Design a protein around this ligand. Structure first.
Ligand SMILES: O=P(O)(O)O[C@H]1[C@H](OP(=O)(O)O)[C@@H](OP(=O)(O)O)[C@H](OP(=O)(O)O)[C@@H](OP(=O)(O)O)[C@H]1OP(=O)(O)O
Lengths: 498, 843, 106
């Protein structure tokens, strides 16, 4: 009772999906026929006509057989199991054999020994391509327990990010810091963890000692665009163009255009966007943006449709494995449909205040991540200066503060105020746009300039109450109601600060 | 249509037969299945051209199906072994149309034809060649599956003494080597040069040319263009309407070709034709000894006849490739052209004179015979493209060309057709002509003259301040409107009406023209009616005092036909008509939006697909026009659309469903809140991405995920045992438990209705092998097993009662709790039927 | 440092105008695309081509970076600003007729 089995093992002449699926079906039914326990052997006839029955008894048939085999047949089997996973792997066959390996771990018999170490390396790699990230993690943790290596830690980090567990990945970096120090920690690890401040420090330390390399340049530029330091990012571009190859050129322009757009230099942006490949989502998006800058409405819509077409591949892949992975694509679709509502905003003066209200309600449903907000606000800034909509950029400044990026929060608020109070320390704060000024003071308090903040607040409230009294007419009643709602919050801050 | 369908079948069996095959294809566009298979079989066995016309046309339109593929495959497999010419190429076209259908059997059908084509490699050999050529064009992937057999068998079969194979098999090698270059070359050059060392000439020259031609498209792109011979700044409408080896062998490809062309200069018409095609493309790769062997064959073939057409095409490529050195043979070529033209073939001569410029002041003297040849579509295409590339005397070109047209139009039928096509194709500088053209169209009984003279005048009125000129334009356009109303031939009426563009709206807005246009809104042809109601809606800004009362009357009538006519077609046409008003007259419709929208929602809650599709396209167009006044009705509209999106049962297309939903979310500004109200929205819209195959639809399904915003993942979370069995038990218990669990799953639902006997037998054998330990499983087995006996039918009943008896014999005393139900079962299903009585008595 | 300059040749005025010698003129007719032509002209006096998309239609039909243009869609633009040419190409038809200086490796 091991001739047909050994044919099904050492066949390996399968060059399609249904061929391996046929191998599975023949394997399962031969295990049922073999199976010593007659309760399983009786189900063989049903399993033939109906496939679900064969698959539900797969793990039980296997254990029954694998226990009977006198070691030699187990090696014949295990060798065939190794070959099937390693070569000509089919998703459906794999996740069957992964569920078999997991069932075997929970069994008293113990895990099947494949290619030494019970295949802790093979089954992990296979579960990763199956996108079974919890199995991948379990197996990668078993490998870590046996020994700690930098490669293992890297893979552990990437597994955690795919599984939407940011805190665990951060813990892996803390382990690396203690036991390996700093040299073993690559900058890419910070990049994966969204530690853009520490990644820039790492890329600066690396680019000082080691000679400048394409890889470390793009890594540091990627950190600068995530932080939003468009000044430094555009300086690195202008300095290094002829010094760079055409392969890195295509990996550069996507970041160089973002920097030019941020600074508002449209000539530079046109040069960079042409260097971006058309096949990429971003290449279509940035061409569609330079369309709306030049009022090429007809071409913009064309470019947007190709952009959606190229986002097909991304949206489908991410949606397959949880909504959380699909969020990145969802933000891309957000920006595409916002570019459609910039064409309307530039064509319909009657629609303007409606569009702004829609924009405001949409941004509040979107997640409070600063990267996502910066993207969206940069798009809307194509036709709406920050002064024409304060509340958007104030809520933005709030997020920057609470996410521990007070430098960006400060820049944002200075841009809204109109001048720098930081420079003119002796002067009083400007009273025009009082909601902005108030936000600046409560930022200054968080920056531990709390004696100065308190003094500014006393000056401001005296100004407010005098600006109310003298300007109170019957006309401005909604304005007066907003001015009192402000003054009230000012008085409360005064108290708690005192 | 049965009797009449077989009547027109023999009529198409015995121009007229192509118009009946196009009518049968048009009848298949709207549209039993057995009678169409019998009617196809009736035409098949009888004649063979009409049978191929019946097979291929139906499969493409009615759609390939497993039934239709299995049947018609036998018909196609019978025709190929032995057939006549012409019918064979029609049957090969029916293969190409079947192979591009995009069905699951296409993989089998294509590889069946390809494998049998390799077996052959004369109605057998040329059939396999036509199969391989069309499959190489239509299906590159499965054609690439057998490339090593392809080259080896074909380099043997090509060099057999045949002409039809040499024409097609080299074109198959063309389709193959293009796919190889974009992604063999040594095996091609070896077998080609072996063949060169008069049947073995014109094939080798084409193979060497393939390495030259594919490596350099510059030679082919001139021939490809001569064989065939809006704006980005426009503002979109505010309401969106619904929608190496070939370079290192190329030198040997010309060296082994500049000898064949010099040797086989006049051996065994066909060889000279392929030589004069290849020689210029080889010279365009690398131009003096190579030129002298080319020039001797080309120049000698120009003086001769039956080649003069292809000779100038080769000569035009040679003139562009060899720039300076060709200038020596200018007096020879130009003397032959000056001798060739006086007889009036020369339609190509002008095309190549255009490629000669593609220059000197001598051409000015060359114009006086050129124009004296006569009006041809090549000549005026040349002189137009001549003034494009070399605009040295564009004024002198138009002077002579208008003088030619004036001599013509001062003075049979097909020439007047082409003379009007000329007069209306490209720009010109025409008042008397048009007032005389106002006489010709009225006083011509020829449909094609009227239809072309209409196309011409509508094109020639693009220059549209002196009062007399306005009164003339007003007169002509009044005559045109009269023709557009009164002409019997609706094609002529459609052309004229379609030609009254935005350009004329200054004239159409005149009182007299508007009184005509109103009459036109009651035209017999719905399409003209649509186009007329669009024009009046577009003019509602120019003269609203007149237009708005009339569109109101029309709106009432449209909504009357919608609500009160109980007919699919009329209602479908009425919605479409209401469509054109919303888009073209949004100001008029805005005050009446709440009445219209209530009428449309009532149509959506009525218990034909095209009616619902046009109603959805109108509601979508109303969204943008409403301008935030439709918010109150947003909730009702959303519920209806969501009910219709889920499932494919609904006749209405998902595309327009998703499009109108887009337009509502966009204009009304319902964002984030719809996600809370309808939580399955994100599950519906991510299901289309895994189901829909259309691009347009997938684009909308994305554009709607865009407008609705990107929901935070947490906000979406708010908006929304077998291993355990083994974890506990020992294995000897586990195996029954897992067997039982697996059998119980199948037991419930209609799965049992198929695997009834098998499931029941397994459960019994398990209980017998266990003994009295099966008592454990009783509470699982019994309630299901009893409900199975209740709802089982026919023969299965008896078997179940037999197996229940076995069960009871094993369970013994433990069956007491369920005994009461069993008795009730027996009491209900005891009948005088002898069979069940013996069964129950045993139980 | 905000502008970028990729042209080695400092000035070509009064050198192109002279017939013959360093270059041989060629006319390249470029058809529009769904996403754009993909070329940029940033020459003050001569309007030299700034960059070309390698995957775009222009790169397929020659159109190398180191080139100079003097006429677009018929109109001669030998002496105009680069920005003015950018207005003409956008306001013109989808298909653009372009003349490239195409210096012969000198
Ligand atoms: O961070 P805080 O100092 O406690 O300030 C909060 C915070 O305002 P910011 O937008 O400046 O951060 C709240 O906003 P959230 O981040 O929680 O959304 C805001 O609440 P609203 O968003 O409802 O306006 C609230 O304002 P209020 O006191 O009117 O409820 C305001 O408090 P203070 O102005 O008193 O500091």
């Amino acid at each position: 009772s091991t001739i047909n089995l050994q044919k099904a093992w050492g066949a390996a002449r399968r060059v399609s999906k249904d061929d391996w699926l046929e191998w599975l079906r023949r394997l399962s039914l031969e295990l049922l026929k073999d199976s010593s326990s007659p309760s399983l052997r009786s189900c063989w006839a049903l399993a033939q006509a109906y496939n679900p029955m064969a698959r539900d008894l797969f793990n039980a048939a296997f254990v029954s057989c694998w226990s009977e085999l006198n070691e030699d047949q187990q090696d014949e089997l295990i060798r065939s199991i190794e070959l099937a996973l390693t070569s000509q792997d089919i998703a459906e066959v794999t996740q069957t054999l992964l569920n078999l390996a997991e069932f075997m771990e929970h069994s008293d018999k113990g895990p099947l020994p494949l290619r030494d170490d019970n295949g802790i390396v093979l089954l992990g790699e296979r579960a990763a391509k199956c996108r079974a990230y919890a199995k991948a993690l379990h197996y990668k943790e078993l490998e870590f327990q046996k020994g700690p290596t930098p490669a293992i830690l890297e893979s552990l980090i990437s597994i955690n990010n795919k599984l939407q567990q940011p805190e665990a990945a951060a813990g892996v970096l803390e382990y690396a810091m203690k036991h390996f120090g700093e040299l073993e920690i690559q900058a890419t690890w910070y990049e994966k963890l969204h530690e853009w401040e520490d990644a820039l420090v790492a890329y600066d330390k690396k680019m000082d000692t080691n000679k400048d390399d394409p890889e470390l340049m793009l890594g540091r530029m990627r950190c600068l665009e995530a932080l939003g330091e468009w000044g430094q990012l555009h300086q690195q571009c202008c300095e290094k163009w002829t010094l760079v190859n055409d392969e890195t050129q295509a990996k550069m322009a996507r970041m160089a255009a973002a920097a030019a757009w941020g600074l508002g230099q449209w000539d530079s942006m046109e040069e960079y966007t042409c260097m971006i490949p058309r096949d990429t989502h971003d290449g279509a998006f940035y061409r569609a943006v330079l369309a709306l800058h030049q009022d090429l409405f007809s071409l913009a819509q064309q470019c947007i449709d190709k952009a959606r077409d190229l986002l097909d591949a991304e949206l489908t892949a991410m949606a397959g494995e949880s909504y959380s992975r699909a969020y990145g694509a969802m933000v891309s679709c957000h920006m595409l449909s916002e570019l459609e509502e910039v064409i309307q905003y530039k064509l319909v003066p009657e629609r303007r205040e409606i569009i702004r209200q829609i924009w405001w309600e949409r941004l509040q449903g979107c997640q409070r991540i600063v990267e996502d907000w910066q993207k969206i606000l940069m798009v809307r800034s194509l036709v709406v200066s920050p002064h024409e909509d304060m509340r958007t950029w104030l809520k933005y400044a709030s997020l920057c503060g609470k996410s521990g990026r007070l430098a960006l929060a400060h820049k944002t608020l200075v841009l809204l105020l109109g001048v720098d109070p930081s420079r003119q320390l002796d002067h009083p704060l400007p009273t025009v746009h009082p909601q902005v000024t108030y936000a600046y003071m409560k930022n200054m308090w968080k920056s531990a300039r709390k004696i100065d903040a308190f003094q500014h607040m006393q000056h401001f409230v005296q100004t407010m109450q005098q600006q109310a009294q003298h300007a109170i007419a019957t006309e401005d009643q909604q304005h007066k109601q907003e001015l009192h709602k402000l003054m009230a919050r000012c008085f409360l801050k005064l108290g708690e600060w005192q | 249509x049965x009797x009449x369908x077989x009547x027109x079948x023999x009529x198409x069996x015995x121009x007229x037969x192509x118009x009946x095959x196009x009518x049968x294809x048009x009848x298949x566009x709207x549209x039993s299945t057995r009678f169409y298979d019998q009617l196809n079989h009736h035409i098949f066995e009888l004649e063979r051209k009409g049978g191929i016309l019946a097979i291929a046309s139906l499969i493409g339109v009615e759609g390939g199906n497993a039934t239709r593929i299995g049947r018609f495959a036998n018909y196609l497999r019978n025709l190929l072994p032995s057939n006549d010419p012409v019918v064979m190429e029609m049957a090969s076209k029916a293969i190409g149309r079947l192979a591009m259908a995009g069905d699951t059997f296409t993989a089998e059908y294509v590889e069946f034809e390809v494998k049998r084509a390799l077996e052959w490699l004369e109605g057998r050999r040329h059939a396999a060649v036509l199969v391989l050529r069309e499959l190489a064009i239509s299906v590159p992937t499965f054609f690439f599956q057998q490339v090593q057999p392809f080259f080896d068998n074909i380099f043997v079969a090509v060099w057999d003494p045949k002409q039809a194979i040499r024409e097609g098999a080299v074109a198959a090698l063309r389709a193959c080597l293009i796919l190889t270059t974009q992604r063999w070359y040594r095996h091609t050059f070896e077998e080609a040069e072996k063949g060169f060392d008069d049947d073995r000439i014109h094939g080798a020259l084409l193979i060497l040319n393939e390495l030259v031609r594919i490596s350099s498209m510059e030679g082919e792109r001139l021939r490809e263009e001569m064989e065939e011979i809006m704006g980005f700044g426009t503002k979109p409408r505010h309401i969106t309407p619904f929608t190496x080896x070939x370079x290192x062998x190329x030198x040997x490809x010309x060296x082994x070709x500049x000898x064949x062309x010099x040797x086989x200069x006049x051996x065994x018409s066909l060889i000279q034709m392929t030589i004069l095609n290849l020689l210029p493309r080889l010279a365009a790769f690398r131009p003096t000894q190579y030129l002298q062997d080319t020039m001797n064959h080309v120049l000698s073939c120009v003086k001769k006849e039956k080649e003069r057409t292809a000779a100038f095409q080769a000569l035009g490529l040679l003139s562009v490739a060899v720039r300076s050195e060709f200038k020596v043979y200018l007096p020879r070529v130009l003397d032959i052209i000056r001798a060739a033209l006086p007889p009036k073939v020369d339609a190509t001569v002008f095309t190549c004179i255009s490629m000669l410029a593609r220059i000197q002041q001598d051409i000015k003297e060359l114009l006086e015979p050129m124009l004296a040849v006569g009006l041809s579509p090549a000549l005026t295409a040349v002189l137009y493209d001549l003034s494009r590339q070399i605009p040295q005397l564009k004024k002198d070109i138009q002077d002579g060309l208008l003088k030619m047209l004036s001599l013509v139009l001062m003075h049979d039928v097909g020439s007047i057709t082409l003379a009007l096509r000329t007069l209306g194709s490209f720009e010109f500088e025409l008042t008397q002509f048009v007032r005389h053209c106002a006489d010709h169209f009225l006083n011509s009984e020829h449909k094609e003259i009227r239809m072309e003279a209409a196309r011409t005048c509508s094109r020639l009125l693009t220059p549209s301040v002196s009062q007399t000129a306005v009164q003339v334009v007003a007169d002509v356009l009044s005559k045109l409107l009269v023709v557009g109303i009164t002409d019997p031939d609706p094609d002529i009426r459609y052309c004229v009406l379609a030609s009254l563009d935005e350009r004329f709206d200054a004239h159409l807005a005149q009182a007299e023209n508007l009184q005509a246009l109103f009459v036109a809104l009651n035209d017999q042809v719905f399409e003209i009616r649509e186009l007329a109601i669009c024009t009046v809606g577009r003019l509602s800004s120019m003269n609203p005092a007149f237009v708005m009362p009339f569109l109101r009357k029309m709106l009432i009538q449209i909504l009357t036909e919608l609500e009160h006519s109980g007919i699919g077609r009329i209602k479908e046409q009425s919605a479409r008509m209401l469509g054109h008003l919303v888009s073209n007259a949004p100001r008029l419709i805005r005050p009446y939006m709440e009445p219209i929208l209530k009428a449309l929602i009532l149509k959506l809650k009525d218990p034909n697909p095209g009616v619902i599709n046009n109603v959805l396209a109108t509601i979508g167009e109303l969204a943008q026009v409403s301008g935030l006044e439709m918010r109150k009705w947003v909730d009702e509209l959303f519920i209806i659309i969501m009910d219709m999106l889920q499932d494919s049962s609904l006749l209405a297309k998902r595309q327009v469903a998703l499009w109108t939903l887009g337009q509502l979310v966009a204009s009304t500004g319902y964002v984030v809140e719809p996600y809370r109200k309808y939580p399955t929205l994100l599950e519906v819209l991510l299901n289309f991405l895994k189901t829909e195959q259309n691009q347009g639809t997938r684009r909308e399904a994305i554009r709607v995920l865009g407008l609705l915003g990107a929901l935070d993942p947490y906000k979406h979370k708010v908006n929304i045992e077998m291993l355990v069995n083994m974890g506990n038990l020992p294995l000897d218990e586990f195996y029954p438990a897992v067997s039982m669990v697996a059998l119980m799953r199948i037991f419930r639902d209609q799965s049992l209705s198929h695997h009834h006997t098998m499931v029941v037998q397994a459960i019994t054998f398990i209980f017998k092998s266990l003994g009295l330990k099966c008592v454990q499983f009783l509470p699982q087995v019994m309630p299901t097993f009893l409900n199975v006996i209740r709802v089982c039918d026919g023969a299965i009943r008896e078997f179940l009662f037999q197996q229940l008896g076995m069960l009871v014999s094993f369970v013994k005393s433990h069956i007491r709790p369920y005994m009461d139900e069993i008795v009730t079962l027996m009491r209900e299903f005891w009948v005088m039927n002898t069979s069940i009585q013996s069964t129950i008595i045993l139980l | 440092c905000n502008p970028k300059s990729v042209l080695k040749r400092p000035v070509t005025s009064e050198e192109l105008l002279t017939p013959g010698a360093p270059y041989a003129r060629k006319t390249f007719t470029i058809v529009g695309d769904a996403v754009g032509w993909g070329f940029v002209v940033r020459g003050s006096k001569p309007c030299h081509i700034q960059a070309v998309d390698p995957s775009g239609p222009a790169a397929a039909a020659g159109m190398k970076v180191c080139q100079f243009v003097v006429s677009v869609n018929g109109l001669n633009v030998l002496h105009v600003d680069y920005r003015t040419v950018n207005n003409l190409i956008l306001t013109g038809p989808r298909t653009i007729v372009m003349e490239v200086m195409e210096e012969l490796e000198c």
